Amino acid sequence: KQKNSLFNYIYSLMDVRGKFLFFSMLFITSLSSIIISISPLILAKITDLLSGSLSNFSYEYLVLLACLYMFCVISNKASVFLFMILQSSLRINMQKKMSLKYLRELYNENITNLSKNNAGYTTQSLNQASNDIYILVRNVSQNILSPVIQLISTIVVVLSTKDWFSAGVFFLYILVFVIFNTRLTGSLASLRKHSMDITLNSYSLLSDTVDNMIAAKKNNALRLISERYEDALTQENNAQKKYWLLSSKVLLLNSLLAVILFGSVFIYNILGVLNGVVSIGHFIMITSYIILLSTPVENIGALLSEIRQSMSSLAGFIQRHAENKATSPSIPFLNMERKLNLSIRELSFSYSDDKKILNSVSLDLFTGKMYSLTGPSGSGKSTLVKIISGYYKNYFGDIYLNDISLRNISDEDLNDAIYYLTQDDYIFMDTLRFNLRLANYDASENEIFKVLKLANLSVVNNEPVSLDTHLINRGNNYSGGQKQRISLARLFLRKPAIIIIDEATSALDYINESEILSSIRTHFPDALIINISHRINLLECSDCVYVLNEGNIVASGHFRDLMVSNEYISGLASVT
Amino acid sequence: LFNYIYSLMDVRGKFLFFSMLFITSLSSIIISISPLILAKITDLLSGSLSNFSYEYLVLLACLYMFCVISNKASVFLFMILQSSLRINMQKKMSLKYLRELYNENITNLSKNNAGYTTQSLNQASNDIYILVRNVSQNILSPVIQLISTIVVVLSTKDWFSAGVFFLYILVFVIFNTRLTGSLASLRKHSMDITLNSYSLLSDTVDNMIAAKKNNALRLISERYEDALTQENNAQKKYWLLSSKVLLLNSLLAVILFGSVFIYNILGVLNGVVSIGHFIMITSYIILLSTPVENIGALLSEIRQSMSSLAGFIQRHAENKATSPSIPFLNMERKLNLSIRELSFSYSDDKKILNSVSLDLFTGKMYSLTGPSGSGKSTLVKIISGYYKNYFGDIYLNDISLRNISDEDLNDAIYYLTQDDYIFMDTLRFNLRLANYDASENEIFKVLKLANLSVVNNEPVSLDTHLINRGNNYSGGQKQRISLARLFLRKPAIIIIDEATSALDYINESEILSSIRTHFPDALIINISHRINLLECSDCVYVLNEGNIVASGHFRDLMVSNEYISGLASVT
Numbered sequence A: 001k002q003k004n005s006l007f008n009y010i011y012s013l014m015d016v017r018g019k020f021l022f023f024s025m026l027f028i029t030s031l032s033s034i035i036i037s038i039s040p041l042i043l044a045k046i047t048d049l050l051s052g053s054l055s056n057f058s059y060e061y062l063v064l065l066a067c068l069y070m071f072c073v074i075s076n077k078a079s080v081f082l083f084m085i086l087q088s089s090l091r092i093n094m095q096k097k098m099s100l101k102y103l104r105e106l107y108n109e110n111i112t113n114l115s116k117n118n119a120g121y122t123t124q125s126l127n128q129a130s131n132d133i134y135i136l137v138r139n140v141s142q143n144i145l146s147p148v149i150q151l152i153s154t155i156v157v158v159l160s161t162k163d164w165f166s167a168g169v170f171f172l173y174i175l176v177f178v179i180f181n182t183r184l185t186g187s188l189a190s191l192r193k194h195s196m197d198i199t200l201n202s203y204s205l206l207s208d209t210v211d212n213m214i215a216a217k218k219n220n221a222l223r224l225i226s227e228r229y230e231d232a233l234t235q236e237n238n239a240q241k242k243y244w245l246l247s248s249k250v251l252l253l254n255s256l257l258a259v260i261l262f263g264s265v266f267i268y269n270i271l272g273v274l275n276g277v278v279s280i281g282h283f284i285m286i287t288s289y290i291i292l293l294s295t296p297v298e299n300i301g302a303l304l305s306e307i308r309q310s311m312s313s314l315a316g317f318i319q320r321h322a323e324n325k326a327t328s329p330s331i332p333f334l335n336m337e338r339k340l341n342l343s344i345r346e347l348s349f350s351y352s353d354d355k356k357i358l359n360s361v362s363l364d365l366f367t368g369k370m371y372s373l374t375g376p377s378g379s380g381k382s383t384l385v386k387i388i389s390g391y392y393k394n395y396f397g398d399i400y401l402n403d404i405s406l407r408n409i410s411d412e413d414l415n416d417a418i419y420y421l422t423q424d425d426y427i428f429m430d431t432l433r434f435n436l437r438l439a440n441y442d443a444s445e446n447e448i449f450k451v452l453k454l455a456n457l458s459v460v461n462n463e464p465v466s467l468d469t470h471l472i473n474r475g476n477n478y479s480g481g482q483k484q485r486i487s488l489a490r491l492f493l494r495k496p497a498i499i500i501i502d503e504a505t506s507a508l509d510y511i512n513e514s515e516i517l518s519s520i521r522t523h524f525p526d527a528l529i530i531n532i533s534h535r536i537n538l539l540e541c542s543d544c545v546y547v548l549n550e551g552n553i554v555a556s557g558h559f560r561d562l563m564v565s566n567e568y569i570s571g572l573a574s575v576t
Numbered sequence B: 001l002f003n004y005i006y007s008l009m010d011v012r013g014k015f016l017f018f019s020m021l022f023i024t025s026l027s028s029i030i031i032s033i034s035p036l037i038l039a040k041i042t043d044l045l046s047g048s049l050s051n052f053s054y055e056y057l058v059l060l061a062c063l064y065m066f067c068v069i070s071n072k073a074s075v076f077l078f079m080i081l082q083s084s085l086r087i088n089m090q091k092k093m094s095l096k097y098l099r100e101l102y103n104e105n106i107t108n109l110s111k112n113n114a115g116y117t118t119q120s121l122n123q124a125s126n127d128i129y130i131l132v133r134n135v136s137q138n139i140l141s142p143v144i145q146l147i148s149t150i151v152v153v154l155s156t157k158d159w160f161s162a163g164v165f166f167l168y169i170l171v172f173v174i175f176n177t178r179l180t181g182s183l184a185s186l187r188k189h190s191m192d193i194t195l196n197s198y199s200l201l202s203d204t205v206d207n208m209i210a211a212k213k214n215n216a217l218r219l220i221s222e223r224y225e226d227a228l229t230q231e232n233n234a235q236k237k238y239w240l241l242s243s244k245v246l247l248l249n250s251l252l253a254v255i256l257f258g259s260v261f262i263y264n265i266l267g268v269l270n271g272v273v274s275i276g277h278f279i280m281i282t283s284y285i286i287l288l289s290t291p292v293e294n295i296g297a298l299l300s301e302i303r304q305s306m307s308s309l310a311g312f313i314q315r316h317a318e319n320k321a322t323s324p325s326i327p328f329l330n331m332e333r334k335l336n337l338s339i340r341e342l343s344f345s346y347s348d349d350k351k352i353l354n355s356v357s358l359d360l361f362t363g364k365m366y367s368l369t370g371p372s373g374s375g376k377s378t379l380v381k382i383i384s385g386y387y388k389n390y391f392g393d394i395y396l397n398d399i400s401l402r403n404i405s406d407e408d409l410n411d412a413i414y415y416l417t418q419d420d421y422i423f424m425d426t427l428r429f430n431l432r433l434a435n436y437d438a439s440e441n442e443i444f445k446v447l448k449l450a451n452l453s454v455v456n457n458e459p460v461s462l463d464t465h466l467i468n469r470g471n472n473y474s475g476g477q478k479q480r481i482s483l484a485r486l487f488l489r490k491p492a493i494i495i496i497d498e499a500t501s502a503l504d505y506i507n508e509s510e511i512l513s514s515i516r517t518h519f520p521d522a523l524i525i526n527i528s529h530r531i532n533l534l535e536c537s538d539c540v541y542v543l544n545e546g547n548i549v550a551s552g553h554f555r556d557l558m559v560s561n562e563y564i565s566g567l568a569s570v571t
């Protein structure tokens, strides 16, 4: 079932130019194997014409024979050069389509599955898959028809000259070969997959160490960092050496078998020539076939190995990138109301198992009102808003948005209705313009600059901020607060019903914090605002405060009614 | 360059490399006899065909088989040694890179992402591979086969054949070297665009959640599709030149060797040339393709893998200022900080620190505040030796920062960064980052002081597996990992850059209490917008647009300064 899907996926990556280049590669490889299977006869015809006659033969016929042999050799090499030219053209062709499909496949993945591995891993995963496709494209376009043509014609012709021992031992070899190799192909594929996986693990650890280099540098941790990479590389070498040995054994055994079987056919025809039983022409033909047969034998060996091993390694890739999907019913044409109310009913959640993060959160929130959510680090404020923001769908209980459940809301509509301002910032290495166009693609130069004022990012160090400001990796080109302001500026281009601010202002000064938080309520008057904070002034300003403790909502109501009643908020209101 | 590749080979590596060179050379000696054995077989065919002529034909046919067998055994043996050598050189290459990356400056490290550095290793490893190959295979072997050919064809006194043969190698080596550089430049430029593309993929994948939640598939996809289009165009430009060189080299071979074939045909038809010699000549024409091909590779591959490997050494061994350092410095337990007229720019375009003049002392806690963009982080980063391109001076008990080794500075100062850097590993590993030699107990002791010894009424295990960017943990729990690291370290200066923002008053005050307890003589710089730290400090410093605008006690500043007055009014 998955075998059919694999080849259909490779075929789909080929546009019209791609399909021609692939069939041209198959044709040229097939045509040249026809032509080169003629050449051992030409050689035999040259040999007899000369053998016996004492320079008494048609010199014009020898020239015609020698020219035909040359045509064979020239056309076969022209074919090799033409195949590799078409091969690289098809690699280039299929490359772009493959890479975009990956990015688009990664975008449609769930946050839980995305978080599982880093960039180093996903980057090298594409690498392996691309190469796996390449191998499969090659093995199909080159090692299917061509070795069959050359092996069929060889037994047909040697059978025609009524040499039974030669054609016999020849057919015996292809039989013993195809059996022996298939009986060891899977054993190689498993050893190769396990290696390639360890290789991913190693690239994963390199990107992890390089992304956190400053930390390792400042803690003078070269030894600790170096040793855990050195361990990964040692796991890589050992996995590679295990493949190497099996690969080397198969090659040595296949070589020894060829020497024993084809060596006998060579000795047999030598004795046949010495006892006048066999002609020299025929002896040269059998000699010519023994030599010619190596490349189709090689191309079969390759196909049996390469097709199975690249199909195994490519199977594993398609699995960890298209699998994780529960159901998701969604609504066909939903046009959400400008005013939305949130109703969380007996919400329960666990990230893993054994430990529950949200016990039975029951809340009811309404349009145009600001609410504060607080609790100790580990209560699950972020978790709760993440679930409201559709990060996770594996939850017990229900969440409504004006009668409509979250389960029946499309991820596109949900993201248009709600805007979550994350605890950590996500700044793209690009222009400031690009980082803001993330929020709204169709936004004009003015709409974007207007938004900079709202996020207090229109002027930095008495200088006007350019929309063409290049932003370094993780936006570390900008201050902690300036990073927060990028993410805040995004909100102003968006048009949501619910606005979640998860400690999204923590890096800002008292002036900026208040001005932006003011601009949010001004710009979005009907927006329901959930605010996560450990600070009394941010809790004070809200229409109602909710205290989360160990998964359950322990206290509700006005801040003043809570600053003495509740154990946590009294703990906050310890200062002053 | 070649010394760097050679250095990557241990004793087993050097054997495997020389075995590859030897076997490649030996097989080219053996296979260069081959056209003469074919000639002798053609000679015998036009003879008497006596018992002895038949026996001689067989012994001859066996020698040609030995040639063909030994040449193929050599191919199989070479590829076996090549993969063994790849495996061998692989580890040594990769660690040298990581160790080279560790010794790089923060400014240069920040320039490119992991996607880029990961694929940069990929390209260089492959460039080494190619070079190892072209040297071990395409130098002695084609020379042997080309020399013996002209020598033998010259011996049989065929001047036109040996003439046009020598003419071909001459026209070939000239034509190709004329186009090699043009190919290398087109290939390097392509490989660089390839890095740019991997860089954009890792940038997009690392910030996927952001792009997902902003329904930005179109903007994200478009950006990558543009990069891929820049990649294809750069690749197609190489492809065309590569394809043209190959077709022109093929057309030259057809014209030159085709003439040698027609000449010897006419020589055979006019009784001038024997059939035995005519075979030997076509046998030499056919044999010559592989050494011509290996020279075609050597010429083109050695140049293009040297160009792209030159670039890799340039960007990974340069941009070093000076650093005079100190031989054996054993820093005093008590250190005072003296910043005198400090000025700094990141990109010279704008000044970030105007003329910061400060003086700080042992066992005293100081607070630094100001608006976002004033330069609090910048200043402490310079104190922490992140940057060295600064005007003015910074002392540490008479000793200047400029004369302090980055290792000693990192032992004297401990900077708790604005953003957290959690390693995807065990909690144990994240804490062992601070001190390698730390025992299981020293590490658990530190978990208590960090307020991380219990999470959700459950005891925290040192074997807790931490996901990419530590997103397996809460904002505050992340901050606590970085804080726990400080307790394994032994510094004189402790900088806390908004390192407790994600913590509530209780824990913020509780951890900051255990810091002062465990590090009594430590000078503490605290960057905070909150007041529960500013009020706790022995002195407050207000930074505004690069210059230090206010000093003294917090209470004396919420009277004098409007910024400190307004900040305190948030009660």
Ligand SMILES: CCCCCCCCC/C=C\CCCCCCC(=O)OC[C@@H](COP(=O)(O)OC[C@H](O)CO)OC(=O)CCCC/C=C/CCCCCCCCC
Residues within 6 Å of the ligand: A151, A152, A153, A155, A156, A171, A174, A178, A179, A182, A183
């Ligand atoms: C003139 C000479 C030209 C060359 C000759 C070409 C012959 C090609 C032979 C290719 C495949 C044959 C099958 C290989 C498995 C045999 C090993 C064997 O014992 O296999 C037992 C199983 C099938 O093998 P498998 O599970 O895949 O694992 C292989 C492993 O060796 C289990 O232990 O079934 C049978 O016993 C039935 C076998 C018959 C199936 C098909 C026959 C078609 C005949 C040829 C037509 C196949 C189509 C391709 C070629 C036209």
Ligand SMILES: Nc1ncnc2c1ncn2[C@@H]1O[C@H](COP(=O)(O)OP(=O)(O)NP(=O)(O)O)[C@@H](O)[C@H]1O
Residues within 6 Å of the ligand: A351, A352, A357, A375, A376, A377, A378, A379, A380, A381, A382, A383, A384, A423, B455, B456, B471, B472, B473, B474, B475, B476, B477, B502
């Ligand atoms: N991805 C994750 N996998 C497993 N557990 C997690 C994950 N993220 C968070 N947790 C745990 O769930 C608990 C609550 O996490 P979270 O919702 O981030 O917290 P919080 O209450 O908002 N804390 P804080 O923002 O730091 O003040 C913590 O004890 C975390 O360790």
Ligand SMILES: Nc1ncnc2c1ncn2[C@@H]1O[C@H](COP(=O)(O)OP(=O)(O)NP(=O)(O)O)[C@@H](O)[C@H]1O
Residues within 6 Å of the ligand: A460, A461, A476, A477, A478, A479, A480, A481, A482, A507, A508, A509, B346, B347, B352, B370, B371, B372, B373, B374, B375, B376, B377, B378, B379, B418, B498
């Ligand atoms: N790596 C960098 N490259 C270029 N400019 C930078 C860099 N880091 C900081 N800046 C700029 O320097 C100024 C101050 O940066 P920084 O020292 O982080 O700030 P801050 O005043 O401490 N702000 P904050 O901690 O976020 O509230 C800002 O205008 C930044 O854009």
Ligand SMILES: [Mg+2]
Residues within 6 Å of the ligand: A381, A382, A383, A423, A502, B474, B475
């Ligand atoms: Mg949180």
Ligand SMILES: [Mg+2]
Residues within 6 Å of the ligand: A479, A480, B376, B377, B378, B418, B497
């Ligand atoms: Mg800062």
